[PDB]
Amino acid sequence: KPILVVGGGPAGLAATHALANVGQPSVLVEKRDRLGGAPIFSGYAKLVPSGRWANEAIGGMVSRIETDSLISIKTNTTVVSFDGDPNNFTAKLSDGTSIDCASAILTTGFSHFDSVNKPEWGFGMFPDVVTTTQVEQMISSGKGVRCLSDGRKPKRVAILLCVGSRDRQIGREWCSKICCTVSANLAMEIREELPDCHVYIYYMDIRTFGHYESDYYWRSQEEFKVKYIKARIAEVTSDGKQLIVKGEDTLVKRPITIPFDMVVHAIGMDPNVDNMTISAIFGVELHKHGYIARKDTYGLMGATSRPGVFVAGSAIGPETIDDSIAQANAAAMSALSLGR
Amino acid sequence: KPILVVGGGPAGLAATHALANVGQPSVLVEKRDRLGGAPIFSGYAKLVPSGRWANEAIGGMVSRIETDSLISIKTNTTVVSFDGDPNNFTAKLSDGTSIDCASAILTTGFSHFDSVNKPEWGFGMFPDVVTTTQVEQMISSGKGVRCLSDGRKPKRVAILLCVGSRDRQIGREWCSKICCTVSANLAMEIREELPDCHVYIYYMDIRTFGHYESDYYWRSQEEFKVKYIKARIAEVTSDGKQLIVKGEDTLVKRPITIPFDMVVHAIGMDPNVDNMTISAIFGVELHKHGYIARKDTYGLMGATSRPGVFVAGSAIGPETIDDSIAQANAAAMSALSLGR
């Protein structure tokens, strides 16, 4: 009897591999054409905290399951119906396949915030307003960091933190957790490629928690001369030659009008746009902010509101790769407990 | 053979229970007289993010293993020698017992920072300078938040963040990760008990990441009127009857001299004082800052530098309870893979 794992990103790749390593078969259902989740589909460059290229690090997590006979992979597929009870579930797939499964682990991840939803910060208005995902792709493709307007190397880059996060006005109250460290990492990578480029990070708080404090926040300043300015950004405009970052220096109303060649948005981790459908299909409760709800960890690790259905990773909220992998292995550990 | 789990806090309690739930026996070695780790021996009150009392939440994690015949608990015991290879280890315990084990999981945790090590901030000088652990104990005992000097209810409380963290001068470069949220939680608990008490939190950054942003940072301000001031604290002194917090108000570079009844230190999570001994005994590498090193998560989740030895939780660095529990379940999952 296999365990159904839904979503083939870092979390689903970790859960299926962990189960295969104890001789438990699984079926991995992935909606996209390829596995790897956001780090692969979105072309991430070097990951935090390892410094390894996502194509290699997550690519290896994909490779090792693609030829493991205990894992049946279904790409370009979704679960259209799910019924039954623990050790007696039936999952029907979009291609007509029916799977008799013991349990299900939801590793369906998140959705990148679309910066068109924060219009005052200029995304979609000006080509040189880019997301962190675009910068990751410029680096990971080896093309390099360049302005989209004319292909030039930027001499001044601003990174705006909290784009689509910590923003009650657009219904996104959460902190997306990893964007501070990702921005510090990207700022160092920009500086390594472009030694004449000045990088400024405009923030509300810097949240390089744990080991990220010295490895990313300190290092970005001392080795790479990245500048950090506490400011509430009002808008991004254009004077026809440069982009202009307008805001209030500190937490008060001290006006700032600073010119830049490129403005990067540290976009947040929205709940997966498919969560209302996943909730209806699997019969699992959602968190008040739209993520898939998880019970407290002291009881059954990774449990959803439904017996026999588990959840791990960014499906539950903004989350890092290391934590998503730990959660996925733990949810696999909980699903195995149903066999007694 | 059984799996050896060292340290009976949240992580060790989670690993042993998860193994027993799949029929794998374990031996839990705990140096102290009781299980529960820091939340129990340090008398934590309500936990984040659950809001449940640690005595109930972690107490249940202890209870459920104390009568599970698949788990052999050895309190007041340490591992004095460890030798062998995966599926062929021998652990010798301080009580003379010898354990033939398949693998070992290190869940040996951390050590609370002692603020006698930041003397300019008044700990040990004045009875009303307390740690967050002391405030947790005032609440969890049901005695309530009271000044040690005369037993009065404080009317003004200051919480100083980053005590023993983010401080290169004392060799503690890391961010201790959970103290921002713990302080916001404690500030709300103080306000709930003492409606006439004003609580001020002095910070460098507020790091209520993920779901903690709206549940703790925003709620502490909007529902509980907790005040947050960005400031670098130079010293804590006394005028004879009250404490004086002296610093520099970051936002508008101007000095501050503010009176308080109680000053709380948000103490950091140092590496376990036993880590050099554990490293020597188990033959595992340490992180540059003294924690137990963990390999990257993309390979084998929870692996140390030594084959067959795993690590989870605050042993690796400052860590939350939910993350420590997930990591412990994941390390149990990796230890099970050694059976092939």
Ligand SMILES: Cc1cc2nc3c(=O)[nH]c(=O)nc-3n(C[C@H](O)[C@H](O)[C@H](O)COP(=O)(O)OP(=O)(O)OC[C@H]3O[C@@H](n4cnc5c(N)ncnc54)[C@H](O)[C@@H]3O)c2cc1C
């Ligand atoms: C710019 C940027 C850089 C980042 N870099 C880092 C970094 O360096 N380090 C770090 O720790 N974190 C990083 N993160 C965070 C990282 O993206 C997440 O931790 C990680 O992708 C979460 O993995 P996951 O498996 O939970 O979800 P995802 O990566 O979102 O994978 C979910 C998978 O499920 C699939 N899926 C979705 N819906 C369905 C459905 N209905 N049916 C079936 N399949 C479905 C998706 O197609 C996808 O393949 C970064 C984030 C951003 C925005």
Ligand SMILES: Cc1cc2nc3c(=O)[nH]c(=O)nc-3n(C[C@H](O)[C@H](O)[C@H](O)COP(=O)(O)OP(=O)(O)OC[C@H]3O[C@@H](n4cnc5c(N)ncnc54)[C@H](O)[C@@H]3O)c2cc1C
């Ligand atoms: C004031 C305060 C409040 C906190 N509140 C929260 C909260 O609300 N929510 C949250 O998520 N986090 C909280 N934390 C963090 C929390 O304490 C940790 O996440 C948690 O204790 C880590 O669990 P652990 O099992 O890794 O380690 P520990 O709790 O440190 O347990 C380690 C165990 O191993 C034992 N041990 C140590 N050395 C040896 C050895 N040589 N041999 C054998 N046994 C050994 C110890 O005696 C102990 O029982 C708080 C921290 C502080 C300082």
Ligand code: SF4
């Ligand atoms: S991690 Fe940093 S950039 Fe991301 S939402 Fe939180 S405070 Fe903003």
Ligand code: SF4
């Ligand atoms: S979590 Fe907050 S209080 Fe703790 S070290 Fe980090 S910034 Fe300081």
